[PDB]
């Protein structure tokens, strides 16, 4: 007779997938055992339907389970900023009369990918350039500007670092690495109102490799 239900080898499986996977990417596999000979022992897997968290959609929109192999594939590329974990409930069910069934839970965890370069929020870039007015009579180490940038990623992938490079004519300004404050280090006395100091603003994140964005800073001396 059909005197054995399908036992999942594990009541809860745990799987990790990195963000921005290819559609159809194999996520994992589940296994239920039916110690019965013949059709009493042929087991079929089904995906149990369920919402995704709070009004995220349907679970069948995100994964699919193979009915014979227990293979669990992804139907779309996962976005970590949009979804970190999803719960997939699978049901193993034999072919006896009446059917015997059991359930298990796959906890799919989404890992972060460095898929965001830092963005310069303020001062806003224009044609890849930046304007900064610096009154001639200013004291040393006074905040001329404040650079604010954002990065959506996690950990070091969102850890930003600011830098000034390729100053001309001379190295008169500096920027705090984590601060984003642009201060006046050099002397600014023997200068005409029109004079300009050009630099390259460099904003990096802590990726490996890092993602970098840049701007063209112009300090005009008023
Ligand atoms: C961003 O800014 C650049 C300005 O250039 C930069 O500015 C500074 C910050 C430094 O980075 C410099 O090193 C850079 O040069 C703007 O560039 C201009 O773009 C316009 C179009 O958008 C260009 O005009 C076109 O180019 C052709 C000009 O032909 C001329 O020469 C022939 C002789 O061979 C002559 O017959 C003709 O009449 C022209 O005199 C032309 O084919 C075309 O029809 C049109 O005129 C212009 O030349 C660029 N200037 C420079 C200096 O490169 C960018 O437009 C700006 N972008 C944005 C989004 O703001
Ligand atoms: C598998 O099937 C049994 C009945 O055969 C159900 O009780 C169970 O909930 C699952 O659907
Ligand atoms: Ca069975
Ligand atoms: Ca993303
Ligand atoms: Ca990311
Ligand atoms: Ca990043
Ligand atoms: Cl697919």
Swiss-Prot record:
Which cellular compartments is it found in? Answer: Cell membrane; Cell projection, Dendrite; Presynaptic cell membrane; Postsynaptic cell membrane
Q: Which GO terms describe its molecular function?
A: calcium ion binding
Residues in domain Cadherin?
A: 9-120, 126-222
Q: Which GO terms describe its biological process?
A: cell adhesion; cell-cell signaling; chemical synaptic transmission; homophilic cell adhesion via plasma membrane adhesion molecules; modulation of chemical synaptic transmission; morphogenesis of embryonic epithelium; regulation of synaptic membrane adhesion; somitogenesis
Question: Chief subcellular site?
Answer: membrane
Q: Which GO terms describe its cellular component?
A: dendrite; glutamatergic synapse; plasma membrane; postsynaptic membrane; presynaptic membrane; Schaffer collateral - CA1 synapse
Instruction: Kindly list every residue the record annotates as glycosylated.
Output: 127
Q: Which domain of life is it from?
A: Eukaryota
Q: Which UniProt keywords apply?
A: Calcium, Cell adhesion, Cell membrane, Cell projection, Glycoprotein, Membrane, Phosphoprotein, Postsynaptic cell membrane, Repeat, Signal, Synapse, Transmembrane, Transmembrane helix
The job of this chain, per UniProt, is described as: Calcium-dependent cell-adhesion protein. May play a role in activity-induced synaptic reorganization underlying long term memory. Could be involved in CDH2 internalization through TAOK2/p38 MAPK pathway. In hippocampal neurons, may play a role in the down-regulation of dendritic spines, maybe through its action on CDH2 endocytosis.
- Subunit text: The N-terminal extracellular domain forms homophilic interactions; these interactions activate p38 MAPK via TAOK2 and trigger endocytosis. Interacts with CDH2; this interaction may lead to CDH2 cointernalization. Interacts with CDH11. Interacts with TAOK2.
The protein's name: Protocadherin-8
> From what organism does this protein derive?
Homo sapiens
Location of this fragment in the whole protein: 490 to 711 of 1070
């Amino acid at each position: 007779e059909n005197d054995n239900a399908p036992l999942f080898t594990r009541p809860v499986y745990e799987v990790s997938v990195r963000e921005n996977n290819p559609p159809g990417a194999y996520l994992a596999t589940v296994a239920a055992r039916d110690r019965d000979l013949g059709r009493n022992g042929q087991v079929t897997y089904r995906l149990l339907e369920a919402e995704v968290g709070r009004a995220g959609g349907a679970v069948s929109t995100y994964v699919s389970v193979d009915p014979a192999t227990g293979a669990i594939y992804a139907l779309r590329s996962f976005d970590y900023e949009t979804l970190r974990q999803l719960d997939v409930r699978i049901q193993a069910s034999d072919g006896g009369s009446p059917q015997l069934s059991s359930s298990a839970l796959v906890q799919v965890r989404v890992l972060d990918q460095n898929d965001h370069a830092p963005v310069l929020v303020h001062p806003a870039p224009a044609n890849g350039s930046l304007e900064v007015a610096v009154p001639g009579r200013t004291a040393k180490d006074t905040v001329v500007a404040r650079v604010q940038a954002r990065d959506a990623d996690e950990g070091a992938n969102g850890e930003l670092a600011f830098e000034l490079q390729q100053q001309e004519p001379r190295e008169a300004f500096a920027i705090g690495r984590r601060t984003g404050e642009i201060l006046l280090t050099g002397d600014l006395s023997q200068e005409p109102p029109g004079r300009v100091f050009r630099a390259l603003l460099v904003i990096s994140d802590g990726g490996r490799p890092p993602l970098t964005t840049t701007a063209t800073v112009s300090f005009v001396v008023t």
